[PDB]
Design a protein around this nucleic acid. Structure first.
Ligand code: ZN
Length: 372
RNA sequence: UUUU
């Protein structure tokens, strides 16, 4: 890789400011968050007309501390008194739920997706302009939402970096697993793993600070008493790198240092995890879910998509690491300079060979495409 | 391999 020049405090200050602006510009207002809670309440009352005892819980980026304006609304549906879906017919329930939702005058384009690993019914909410996705007894997602939320509360730099990673991957168009790339959840795990492995670490491994609490066959314990963390985490407050330093460090870490072919991105343990012991040697980008240890978040990546993703990060390393003549005085927007897709992806679009030629999503043949 |  191209060697990076030495930097100056003024350029470092610019990097710090850009990362913090990613958070300030794209995090929802408190009013926008309250509206998501109101939608949850409305949907729950409506569904209760046909299915009394229905409970809707928000999860994902709406609740884990890293949500964007206009992010989809991730909803987990359960039934009061029924502990698990062990006795619930999930696919038939998704279809029954879809029919009920077609009677809601404020929703459009109900679409049940019953063939996905996690079946969902998704739809468009007219008044908010938001897409909604309802899943059934998605219990582990509730817990990794709580896990990510706790990490976001340890240090403001966690939020700043996760928002910067989110902007970067969305601008490169590599943050949608329904199109064959990686989920934003997966990229957030990459940020947390980088921060855990930093010397000194910015965050601890909460699942290794303390018990066995099992859900769907997996231990979901983690240390969530963040206000008491200085007592149980010896290295607390040791890392004093600025956000901009950490962002460039992340780009260099995953282009220069991290051995994708040898190691797994795993935030459940501080000790390095090898693909060999995991038997996950078929893929290049290997990311382990913190709870569902059989889930490799990179299992869907093709070779072309992997090359595209790595090329994006290599170009980001260059743009954020090599100052340019005329910057910042000839550029009225630092955001447009650093996150220019024509530079980061060199004008190319993300590969879509696995995607339906009609709608651009994976997972279905053309006769079952909604946009036909 | 369409939620997280
Ligand atoms: Zn299609």
């Amino acid at each position: 890789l191209e060697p990076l020049p030495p930097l100056t405090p003024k350029f470092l200050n610019i990097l710090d400011q850009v990362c913090i602006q990613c958070y300030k510009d794209f995090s929802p207002t408190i009013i926008e968050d309250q509206a998501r809670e109101h939608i949850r309440q409305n949907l729950e009352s409506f569904i209760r007309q046909d299915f009394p005892g229905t409970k809707l819980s928000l999860f994902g980026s709406s609740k884990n501390g890293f949500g964007f304006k206009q992010s989809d609304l991730a909803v987990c549906m359960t039934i009061n008194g029924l502990e698990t879906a062990e006795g619930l017919d999930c696919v038939r329930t998704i279809e029954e739920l879809a029919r009920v939702l077609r009677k809601h005058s404020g929703l459009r384009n109900i679409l049940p997706i019953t063939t996905a690993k996690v079946p969902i019914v998704k739809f468009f909410h007219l008044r908010s302009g938001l897409e909604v996705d309802i899943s059934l007894y998605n219990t582990l997602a509730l817990h990794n939402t709580r896990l990510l939320s706790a990490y976001s509360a340890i240090d403001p730099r966690v939020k700043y970096l996760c928002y910067t990673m989110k902007v970067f991957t969305k601008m490169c168009d590599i943050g949608d697993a329904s199109r064959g790339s990686l989920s934003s959840y997966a990229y957030t795990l990459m940020v947390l793993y980088f921060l855990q492995q930093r010397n000194p670490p910015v965050i601890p491994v909460l699942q290794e600070i303390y018990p066995e609490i099992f859900v769907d066959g997996w231990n979901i314990y983690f240390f969530d008493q963040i206000d008491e963390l200085p007592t149980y985490w010896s290295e607390c407050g040791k890392n004093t790198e600025s956000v901009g330093q950490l962002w460039l460090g992340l780009l260099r870490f995953y282009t220069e240092e991290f051995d994708f072919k040898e190691h797994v991105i795993s935030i459940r343990r501080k000790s390095l995890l090898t693909t060999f012991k995991k038997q996950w040697t078929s893929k290049y980008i290997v990311i382990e879910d913190p709870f569902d240890l059989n889930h490799n978040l990179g299992a869907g990546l093709s070779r072309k998509m992997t090359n595209f993703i790595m090329k994006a990060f290599i170009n980001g390393r260059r743009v954020f690491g090599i100052p340019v003549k005329g910057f910042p005085k000839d550029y009225p927007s630092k955001m447009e300079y650093f996150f220019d897709p024509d530079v980061l992806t060199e004008g190319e679009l993300a590969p879509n060979d696995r995607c339906c030629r009609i709608c651009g999503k994976i997972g279905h043949f053309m006769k079952d495409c909604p946009m036909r």
